[PDB]
Amino acid sequence: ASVGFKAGVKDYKLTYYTPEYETLDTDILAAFRVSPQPGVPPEEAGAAVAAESSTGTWTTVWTDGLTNLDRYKGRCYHIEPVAGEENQYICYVAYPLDLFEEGSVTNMFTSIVGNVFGFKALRALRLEDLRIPVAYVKTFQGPPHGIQVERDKLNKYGRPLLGCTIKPKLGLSAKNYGRAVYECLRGGLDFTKDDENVNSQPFMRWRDRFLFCAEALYKAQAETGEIKGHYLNATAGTCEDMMKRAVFARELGVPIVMHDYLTGGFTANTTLSHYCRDNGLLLHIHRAMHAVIDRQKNHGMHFRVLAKALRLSGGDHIHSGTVVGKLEGERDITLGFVDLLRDDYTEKDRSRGIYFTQSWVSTPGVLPVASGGIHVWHMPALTEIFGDDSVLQFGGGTLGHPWGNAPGAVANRVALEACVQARNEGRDLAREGNTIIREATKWSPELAAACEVWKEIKFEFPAMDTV
Amino acid sequence: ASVGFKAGVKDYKLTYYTPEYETLDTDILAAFRVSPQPGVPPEEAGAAVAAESSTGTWTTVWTDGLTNLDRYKGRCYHIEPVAGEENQYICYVAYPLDLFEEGSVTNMFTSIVGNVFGFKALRALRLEDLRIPVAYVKTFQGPPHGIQVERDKLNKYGRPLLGCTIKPKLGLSAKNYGRAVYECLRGGLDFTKDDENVNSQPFMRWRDRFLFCAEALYKAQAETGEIKGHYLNATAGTCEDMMKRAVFARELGVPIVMHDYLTGGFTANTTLSHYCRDNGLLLHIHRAMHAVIDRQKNHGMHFRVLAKALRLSGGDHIHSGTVVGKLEGERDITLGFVDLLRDDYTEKDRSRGIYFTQSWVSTPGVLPVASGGIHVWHMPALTEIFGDDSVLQFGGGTLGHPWGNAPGAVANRVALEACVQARNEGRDLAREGNTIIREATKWSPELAAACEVWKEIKFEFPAMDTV
Amino acid sequence: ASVGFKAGVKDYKLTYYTPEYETLDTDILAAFRVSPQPGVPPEEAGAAVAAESSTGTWTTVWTDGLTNLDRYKGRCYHIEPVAGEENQYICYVAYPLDLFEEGSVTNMFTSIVGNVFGFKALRALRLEDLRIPVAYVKTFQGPPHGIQVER
Amino acid sequence: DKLNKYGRPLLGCTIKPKLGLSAKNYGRAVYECLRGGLDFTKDDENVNSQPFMRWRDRFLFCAEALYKAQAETGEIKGHYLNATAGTCEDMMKRAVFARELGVPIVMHDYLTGGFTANTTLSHYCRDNGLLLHIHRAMHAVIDRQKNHGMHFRVLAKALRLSGGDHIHSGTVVGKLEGERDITLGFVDLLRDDYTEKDRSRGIYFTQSWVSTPGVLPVASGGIHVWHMPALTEIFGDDSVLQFGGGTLGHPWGNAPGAVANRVALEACVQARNEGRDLAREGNTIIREATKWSPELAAACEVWKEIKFEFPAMDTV
Amino acid sequence: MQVWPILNLKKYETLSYLPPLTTDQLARQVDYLLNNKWVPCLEFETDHGFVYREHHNSPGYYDGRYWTMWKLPMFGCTDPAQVLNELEECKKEYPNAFIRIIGFDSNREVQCISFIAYKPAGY
Amino acid sequence: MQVWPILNLKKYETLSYLPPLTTDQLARQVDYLLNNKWVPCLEFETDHGFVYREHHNSPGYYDGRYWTMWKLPMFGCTDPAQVLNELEECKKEYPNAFIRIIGFDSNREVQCISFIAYKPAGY
Ligand SMILES: O=C(O)[C@@](O)(COP(=O)(O)O)[C@@H](O)[C@H](O)COP(=O)(O)O
Ligand SMILES: O=C(O)[C@@](O)(COP(=O)(O)O)[C@@H](O)[C@H](O)COP(=O)(O)O
Ligand SMILES: O=C(O)[C@@](O)(COP(=O)(O)O)[C@@H](O)[C@H](O)COP(=O)(O)O
């Protein structure tokens, strides 16, 4: 059935606002927080977003008649006002499965988030959530290994894993990096790591660092009898350079490498994820740059969307915030996306900002990593918030210990184990946290010295990203 | 010279606020628009930004004594209040050359923009500009070809180049795509192109599209006698897939491919840029997703920074906005970054948002591309704003013509040439624009038909991103 | 929740005949034309087919307790007699998506049709149809071109 | 010669449940089976690479487990790693990693994977010193009925040409169909250099092999300790006897389940070598062994009354 | 400032940096495992109490991760005394072995508990 | 439920899981070999009684498979006493060696018999 072609511009709502539409189980659904310019009706704004991110443009084109636009168009099917907000709405848009390239997070974002945020007709736009249908989820590899496999390879069970970022961030030589690494690992930490911006620089070239860090990690492992790892950074300027670094890590026989997925990019990250699966390397992921995009409530993309994208592209760990540390992260929102990263199924829950029910059809879970301004006194809270399946990282919290790295590592390991034991015995980490730490200081000089130093350090400021 | 190690936290301003510092010509300079939380002094906020993006952390670490922190630390050297803004400041930070990996935009952003935007102590943060020293610029390849070489390969001189995005965005088959392409090209357009989200999908696989588009472009070129191109999209889910697509374009002997640098990523983009230089392919770059980051004045990264990053990583064209079209772009800010993309030297000019003088040491210029909601009546304004060195793209503006693609192409080519001739004769495009178009409609039926349809279409809304 | 391990053989129908099961949209469904040997009840024959082509064997193994067999087992969820045929039934079996390797027809047939056709307890067996869920279909490339592209 | 195993049938075990176990649990089961006396353990035929257990993780954990069992017992061990895959490329990647691990044997499902892929793998195994165990999954779809299809003996000849070091041949006494005379007929066609026409065993033509190596027949499927005398008598030393449920179904676990099977086998080999009639004295030989082997006694109690007897569809 | 020792300081993963568990502390850990409905199991090792690399050096490969199973996992066990009883029995049979208690979560198929319950002389 | 031992449980291939062979049981095995017309031969080893991998780790490669030949295979031997006699003689010369009896089938060129006939002290 076809009607003639009439040149000219028509309102987007005539074709793209579809309130009677019932979503299919194969549709990708998007929840957009839309703030229209004065005089632009919410139905037109939502329709414009749906049109521009799928099949339409600003004027009528005759070529629409060569296909069946009804099966390809994006559709704004529901709109709801945002409480306690001026002229802001949550618009739900449905995208047919056929619009997306299989296994490509790059393609998915290009459509949904490519051009709509710049429309003159909108003051602001934020993507809050995406319902990824199981049929699309199956086209991705997902994490190279995932929680279960990682614990099995490393033989670590019953407690959060412990890591430490070497400091200062930049400026140390390859040999000094390895020296710091051995001292941290021998004191009880499971992992040490290159900082996110440590790639290859004049003060320390990557191959020299990989070599010295391997020597240091093997020495700490032999000394303690526990498996150790040091995340070697594969982030690089080109796909080729990234691969060369991953390849040398493979040659050294180490267990884990890392990548900055947003600054390196999805295309490069997916290549690395596949390489890690093929070569048995664990992949730690940094979310460097995420706050440029996800901090403000009125504009950008919420972190939960970036977290889902990483679980599809692939990563064994991903930084998820600390809640109590130096960087922003509200408790409920955080618990919301931590479930989205670890579980196989998460039901819609607006109180935690989860707009859609999401199933993963057995795609492996990703280990959340809490890092950034945390110390021994935060241990009970961290253990309580994240539970066993998490990695807790202490950079300044280890290298800032008055007696050095090994004692700094001991303090963190003892504090963690004291909390795990207390929790397992039935104690309330939330009510008894400080008491549990104090009790441990009676027999651990290393912990006592750490507690004295950071006793009054807290990070409390109003959050910008709230439900 | 060394002082003892005292564990504990100290204010960042003690080490990172350095108002007496004279910047070196090798330093990367950053201008941050900082909005501190109540009670956080601007000097401390600026110092925190400088520390966290370079060498420091939240507490004192003994390892600082193993290096010379004075030569590696980032430094907030100047702070100025923002006029007509509450508790907002422009903080200038200097980063030594040694902190960066040569030829890696990925590494540069990881440091400068990696973690600072999420500090609990800040309400908002925006990176406005970066002064890239010539010593760092020389470590990059830059555009595979650049303006001069591109005009020389295509034999096109004396006027803006003309392109057209095929519509609907998604939903057309490979054969229908080629049919639309031939009709557009034969009417006078220099280029046609895959839309940014057209990669490889169920309705049209990439190899079929490349093949039919090559057939269509060769037919239009033989018919008209003018060199033609169709940007084939190489954007893909992995580095490997991206390379396979670029390789087939090379085999077909076509002149140009395209990539979405932000959704594909810098690592993948740099790999493609190098491949294009090695194989003589022009590289058109889409900035899909940029508005998620650069729209709001209070938080994010200004587009001028993303434009500089692309000129380093590499691209022969980059979308730059239209000013008068459907997507946001203020005239002065736009002219500012267009100069940063094309010229060898641009002097500081705060009225256009240019915070630092920037030299390029002969790195090729990039052709700005105006695309998005423009039509024949905008021609005089576009020609006046961009001048000859630009590409003007009309998607709906060609395929929305009442008589079809070839006549739609003729209308755009005639309108452009009428403007070029008028300008060359000394006429004021700004004052006489409408008259010049009307005169041309007297002898061009194709232009007259287009003018009737879009006569009253304008896009005027208040801009969010202003100087 | 776990019960002890009791060594020994039990009827397949105790674990694999599941008439109250509602199929999921992600399950691969199979319609088998089953002809049991005399004395083998259709429920046991259908259950044997479901067990042997998914997770079970002929005697109880303790390792079942290391996983959650409920999420992995094949299930005979429906049986219907064949009209005008002696002692022949159509048994419907459901297989969870997780049992199959993505993009591998070889793996799909190995499970569903690998060993069940030789059971001494059956006289004959024919696979009539398979419902391939869209989630599994998406893991395959399918035709290199297809009708439209070829024309 | 490579494995240094002589004078008795080889013993294997298929890990169960068929699907659903993680990579680490697979290796744990493997070590326990191997340390009790079995020569081999193996991936089930449909264990390729799935959401619950990806192939590379399995290969890695199984290698760790097999090396531990070998060091503990002093006897060479193997775990057949499944190379069956969706494409030739995937199949090759799996065979290549097995080579890297230095393990001795891989497996392939020749009918579901296909002859073209099987021949490629067979050549790769010859070039890299890997033993190749072959599963006949899907054969019964083709060879069960007497009126239509292709008899298994034709599929067995095809495998000996394409290539495989072992091939499943049926058990006769187990849960899957296989008549004694027909089976002995194709077992000769798989092992010998020359087999004369013999219509009583369904051998229509005399077949010579001009020294093409023989293939080891593998009896697997519903067999247990009480079937040992019969299996030894039917197949003789050159065979592999596999006990999946027959090992993992033992009341005391895998290692004791393995011991029960190894002891039962050796008791039969010793009795046969001494001149005893396995056919007449089978039950007595097993009972005698239970007097000194608690592991065997416990297995015998459990499976005492389990037999699989139904009329066969494929008869001469 | 104390220097963290270097000699004879081998560790045993979870709970090994705390003072040795008393009888009651051990029983509490077993209770925790049973209350969460995890399946208890004992493993022992006499020859290689620590991880090493003899057969391969590729990423993620280590020898010594697998120990030997004491009997079978205790499916259906609801009494901590049964576990502690098996521990004593394992100790009497293998006084020279390291013995650990693990607890399986069968839905996720991951060990949610794992700790050393007995160490031979001089460890 | 008995737990299969872990220590000092090295095995020796065929017949090694049965109670040790008595003199008569050993003689019966030798008779079996001769009745089948296989050629008997003795092999002994003092240094590496078990397989290991020192020189290579590729598929199918193991060190320790080859032992040393006692004299020569007994071509034409028809009396079990001759074999048992050589066994005693080998034992007197190498009381510290593992000694096995093998039987060759020369038409197929495969060893059809192979079993340990003597083990040194503490094995
Ligand atoms: O540079 C830093 O700040 C850190 O190295 C932590 O150092 P400290 O351990 O010394 O605090 C990063 O791991 C951030 O935590 C990343 O942030 P997020 O985890 O929120 O992505
Ligand atoms: O999807 C679109 O809107 C376009 O295809 C234009 O279509 P029309 O020509 O039909 O308007 C893109 O080129 C945008 O212009 C990109 O925005 P920017 O150039 O600002 O990056
Ligand atoms: O899935 C199964 O049934 C088995 O794993 C045996 O398990 P159990 O050892 O537990 O019986 C296969 O080896 C079949 O024996 C193949 O049949 P065939 O050998 O006739 O090709």
Technique of determination: X-ray
Q: Decide if A336 is inside a domain.
A: yes
- Residue D12 Rama label (left phi>0; alpha psi -120 to 50; beta): beta
Residues B101 and B145 in one domain: no
Task: Please report how the helices B445-454 and B405-424 are oriented relative to each other, as an axis angle in degrees rounded to 10.
Answer: 100
Domain that holds residue A56: 14-140
Distance CA A243, CA C134 (A): 34
Q: Decide if A151 is inside a domain.
A: yes
Torsion angle defined by CA atoms of residues D122, D123, D129 and D132, in that order, rounded to the nearest 10 degrees: 0
Q: Measured between CB atoms, which of E56, E68, E110 is closest to D63? A: E56
Q: Cβ–Cβ of E60/A255 closer than 8 Å?
A: yes
Distance CA A134, CA A116 (A): 26
Q: Decide if D206 is inside a domain.
A: yes
Residues A176 and A114 in one domain: no
Domain that holds residue E44: 1-123
> What CATH code is carried by the domain that includes residue E108?
3.30.190.10
Torsion angle defined by CA atoms of residues D26, D28, D34 and D40, in that order, rounded to the nearest 10 degrees: 10
H-assigned helices in B29-154: 42-52, 69-72, 105-113, 134-137, 147-154
Q: What letter represents residue D128's amino acid?
A: N
Residues B383 and B446 in one domain: yes
Distance CA A207, CA A194 (A): 13
Chain E interface with C: residues with Cβ < 8 Å: 37, 39, 72-73, 75-76, 104, 106-107, 109
Question: What DSSP state is assigned to residue F71?
Answer: S
What Rg do the C-alpha atoms of chain B give, in angstroms?
24
**The pairing of beta strand A75-81 with beta strand A89-95:** antiparallel
- Measured by CA distance, the residue closest to atom 6 of ligand 2 is B372
Task: Please report, for residues A429, B7, E4, the alpha-carbon distance to residue A407 in angstroms, rounded to integers and kept in the order given.
Answer: 24, 13, 6
Among A142, A177, A181, A147, smallest CA distance to A164 is for A181
Distance CA A63, CA A69 (A): 10
Q: Measured between CB atoms, which of C26, C98, C138 is closest to A139? A: C138
Distance CA B368, CA A118 (A): 17
Residues A178 and A93 in one domain: no
For an interface test with C, which of E105, E106, E107, E110 has the most C Cβ atoms less than 10 Å from its Cβ? E106
Q: Cβ–Cβ of C134/A135 closer than 8 Å?
A: yes
Residues A132 and A164 in one domain: no
Among B287, B304, B296, B297, smallest CA distance to B349 is for B304
Give just the sign of the alpha carbon dihedral B54, B60, B66, B67.
positive
Distance CA A11, CA A3 (A): 18
Q: Cβ–Cβ of D37/F6 closer than 8 Å?
A: no
Question: What DSSP state is assigned to residue E104?
Answer: E
Task: Please report, for residues A250, B455, D10, D264, F25, the alpha-carbon distance to residue D37 in angstroms, rounded to integers and kept in the order given.
Answer: 35, 90, 10, 11, 22
At which of A111, A140, A169 does a domain end? A140
At which of B106, B122, B140 does a domain end? B140
Question: Cα B463 to chain center, whole Å?
Answer: 19
D16 is catalytic: yes
Distance CA B309, CA B132 (A): 10
Q: Cβ–Cβ of A288/B200 closer than 8 Å?
A: no
Contacts of C145 in chain B (CB under 8 A): 208
H/E run at residue B391: strand B391-393
Place of tokens 């096109």: B156
Question: What DSSP state is assigned to residue C53?
Answer: T
At which of A140, A166, A181 does a domain end? A140
- Measured by CA distance, the residue closest to atom 20 of ligand 3 is D170
As beta bridge partners, residue C30 has C93, C130
Q: What letter represents residue A68's amino acid?
A: N
Q: Is B255 in the pocket of ligand 2 (CB under 6 A)?
A: no
* F3 touches E: beta carbon within 8 Å: yes
Distance CA D15, CA D25 (A): 10
D253 min Cα distance to partner chain E (Å): 6
Residue F16 CB: number of other CB atoms within 10 A? Answer: 18
Centre of ligand 3 from the C-alpha of residue D220, in Å: 5
Q: Decide if A265 is inside a domain.
A: yes
Task: Please report how the helices A147-154 and D55-73 are oriented relative to each other, as an axis angle in degrees rounded to 10.
Answer: 30
H-assigned helices in D74-179: 88-101, 110-113, 115-128, 139-143, 152-162
Q: Given the residues D77, D108, D135, D166, select the one marked as catalytic.
A: D135
Taking the alpha carbons at both ends of chain E, their separation in whole angstroms is 26
Contacts of D266 in chain F (CB under 8 A): 14-18
* A277 touches D: beta carbon within 8 Å: yes
Centre of ligand 1 from the C-alpha of residue A158, in Å: 25
Contacts of A250 in chain E (CB under 8 A): 58-59
Residues A213/A180, Cβ–Cβ less than 8 Å: no
Q: Residues near F106 by Cβ (< 8 Å), separated by ≥ 6?
A: F39
**The pairing of beta strand B345-346 with beta strand B358-359:** antiparallel
Domains identified in chain E, total number: 1
Q: Is B245 in the pocket of ligand 2 (CB under 6 A)?
A: no
**What 3 state SS string does A120-135 have?**
CCEEEEEEEEEECCHH
Domains identified in chain D, total number: 1
Residue B84, token pair as written in the block: 């007509």
Q: Decide if B2 is inside a domain.
A: no
H-assigned helices in E49-79: none
Q: Is B396 in the pocket of ligand 2 (CB under 6 A)?
A: yes
Residue C63, token pair as written in the block: 């390792």
A57 is in an annotated binding site: yes
Residues A268/A239, Cβ–Cβ less than 8 Å: yes
Q: Residues near A251 by Cβ (< 8 Å), separated by ≥ 6?
A: none
Q: Is A36 in the pocket of ligand 1 (CB under 6 A)?
A: no
Residue B229, token pair as written in the block: 């191109």
> What CATH code is carried by the domain that includes residue C26?
3.30.70.150
For an interface test with C, which of E75, E105, E110 has the most C Cβ atoms less than 10 Å from its Cβ? E75
Residues B253 and B280 in one domain: yes
The DSSP result for C54-95, as a single string, is TT--SS--GGGGGS-HHHH--EEEEEEEPTTSTT-EEEEEEE
Q: What letter represents residue C90's amino acid?
A: I
Taking the alpha carbons at both ends of chain B, their separation in whole angstroms is 46
A193 is in an annotated binding site: yes
Resolution as reported, in Å: 2.3
Q: Cβ–Cβ of A424/E32 closer than 8 Å?
A: yes
Is the preceding omega at residue A168 within 30 degrees of 0, hence cis?
yes
Among B399, B405, B403, B417, smallest CA distance to B445 is for B403
> What CATH code is carried by the domain that includes residue D58?
3.20.20.110
Residue D241, classed as helix, strand or coil, is: strand
Atom number of ligand 1 nearest to Cα B57: 10
* C148 touches B: beta carbon within 8 Å: yes
Q: Decide if B461 is inside a domain.
A: no
Q: Decide if D313 is inside a domain.
A: no
Q: Is D9 exposed, middle or buried (0-12, 13-18, 19+ CB in 10 A)?
A: buried
H/E run at residue C108: helix C105-113
Distance CA B198, CA B217 (A): 18
Distance CA C90, CA C80 (A): 5
Return the ∠ at Cα C139 (arms to B266 and A277), rounded to 5°.
55
Contacts of E68 in chain F (CB under 8 A): 6
Q: Do chains E and B touch (3 or more CB pairs under 8 A)?
A: no
Residues B437/B377, Cβ–Cβ less than 8 Å: yes
Among B287, B269, B251, smallest CA distance to B141 is for B269
- Judged by CB atoms within 8 Å, which residues 73-102 of E form the interface with F? 93-94
Atom number of ligand 3 nearest to Cα D223: 11
**What 3 state SS string does B438-452 have?**
HHHHCCCHHHHHHHH
